[PDB]
């Protein structure tokens, strides 16, 4: 019997090195991803023990098509600690990986936003990530986490004209307070928020 | 505000209260208990009387006689066991069926533990709960041994039983353990699937 994968294929990793990559959830209810790296597809076909393994246990979000180290079809697995950059040839393979990994991890969504000046947060373009029970803001390539909240620690939030406002409570020490984002998807963000905090997946219904 | 299950349930004297059960996270091993006064104070929209979350769930045990009630379900955690009282065997089965599926891969096997190890001999129940494996006893159930599945070296079905060896990582629970059962081959297949990322029912995770 062979070890299953949510996705597998030829991918570049970090210079760049090409290797056959296997991604799978370590457990049926995992926020984590197990990375299984083989030299080639044959080593995997012949079901030999992988060259290297790694478990990403602090994933904050996914973000495809960021330019990085000479490549354009890259995927970022954003983590509290580090970002893991995946290298693909084709655009559609990258999207396939992004779409498959997203669904598998539960509720993982991203919105391109502009962070308003005035708060502890750095202003300018950024991407807001909802990863199940956690909210994250991410910037730059490779993406780094600049703000993090448990959704359960937010007092208030809501859509506004050309934006979205959320407030972190006492629970989130120095991340407490009111924060302002510009985007055309505030209604989508607020509805996503409304659903999750009540245990509904917008797509799957109740968890 | 959604529920994986709700209905009239007795909880601990027995207090019959409209119970709402749901996951707090779409992919996490937790149950949020929402205790409402009745179906009215819930179907209306009022805030619950009390709430509790259980974040170390390691199994489910239905059909237990407990404090006067024939049909009680135990939600077993590493820390404690939560007892739920029902009226009919069916209503409780419904709750067992619905919770097991919702929490991912949670399985129970009524076994006989053989003497010779740090475990206590006699009838018990092995519980597999996604990442973890557990042996539970009595009413209310208590955990009498625990392992991460990743920390197991070997396992297998044997004529009329099951065996699994724990790695050094396990500490006090390292070593080979023996279980008597008619569901050994079924047990081996489940372990085979899980350690390889396969749900026997749902396929790949």
């Amino acid at each position: 019997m062979t070890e299953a994968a949510l996705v597998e294929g030829q991918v570049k990793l970090r210079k760049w090195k090409s290797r056959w990559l296997v991604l799978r959830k370590p457990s049926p209810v995992a926020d984590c991803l197990l990375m299984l790296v083989y030299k080639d597809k044959c080593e995997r076909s012949k079901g030999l023990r992988e060259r290297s393994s790694l478990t990403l246990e602090d994933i904050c979000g996914l973000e495809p098509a960021l330019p990085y180290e000479g490549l354009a079809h890259t995927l970022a697995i954003i983590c509290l600690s580090q970002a893991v950059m995946l290298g693909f040839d084709s655009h559609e393979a990258m999207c396939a990986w992004d779409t498959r990994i997203r669904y598998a991890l539960g509720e993982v969504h991203r919105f391109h936003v502009t962070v308003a000046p005035g708060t502890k947060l750095e202003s300018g373009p950024a991407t807001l990530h909802l990863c199940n029970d956690i909210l994250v803001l991410a910037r730059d390539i490779p993406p780094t986490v600049m703000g993090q909240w448990k959704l359960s620690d937010l007092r208030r939030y809501g859509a506004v004209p050309n934006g979205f406002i959320f407030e972190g409570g006492t629970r989130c020490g120095y991340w407490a307070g009111v924060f302002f984002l510009s985007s055309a998807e505030g209604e989508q963000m607020s509805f996503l928020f409304d659903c999750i905090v009540r245990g509904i997946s917008p797509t799957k219904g109740p968890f | 505000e959604a529920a994986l299950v709700e209905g009239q349930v007795k909880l601990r004297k027995w207090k019959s209260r409209w119970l709402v059960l749901r996951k707090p996270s779409p992919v996490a091993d937790c149950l949020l208990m929402l205790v409402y006064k009745d179906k009215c104070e819930r179907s209306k929209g009022l805030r619950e009387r009390s709430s509790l979350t259980l974040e170390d769930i390691c199994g489910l045990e239905p059909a237990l006689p407990y404090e006067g009630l024939a049909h009680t379900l135990a939600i077993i955690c590493l820390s404690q066991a939560v007892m739920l009282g029902f009226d009919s065997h069916e209503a409780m089965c419904a709750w067992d069926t619905r919770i097991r599926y919702a929490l991912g891969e949670v399985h129970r096997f009524h076994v006989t533990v053989a003497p010779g190890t740090k475990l206590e001999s006699g009838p018990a129940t092995l519980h597999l709960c996604n990442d973890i494996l557990v042996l539970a006893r009595d009413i209310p159930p208590t955990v009498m041994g625990q392992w991460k599945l990743s920390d197991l070296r070997r396992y297998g079905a044997v004529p009329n039983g099951f065996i699994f060896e724990g790695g050094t990582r396990c500490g006090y629970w390292a070593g080979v353990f023996f279980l008597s059962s008619a569901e050994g081959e079924q047990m081996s297949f489940l372990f085979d699937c899980i350690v390889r990322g396969i749900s026997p029912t749902k396929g790949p995770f």
Binding site: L151, L154, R155, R156, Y157, G158, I165, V197, R198 | -
Partner: peptide, 9 residues
């Protein structure tokens, strides 16, 4: 702005 049902607990 919406209050959060999770927060009251």
């Amino acid at each position: 702005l919406h209050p959060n049902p999770m927060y009251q607990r």
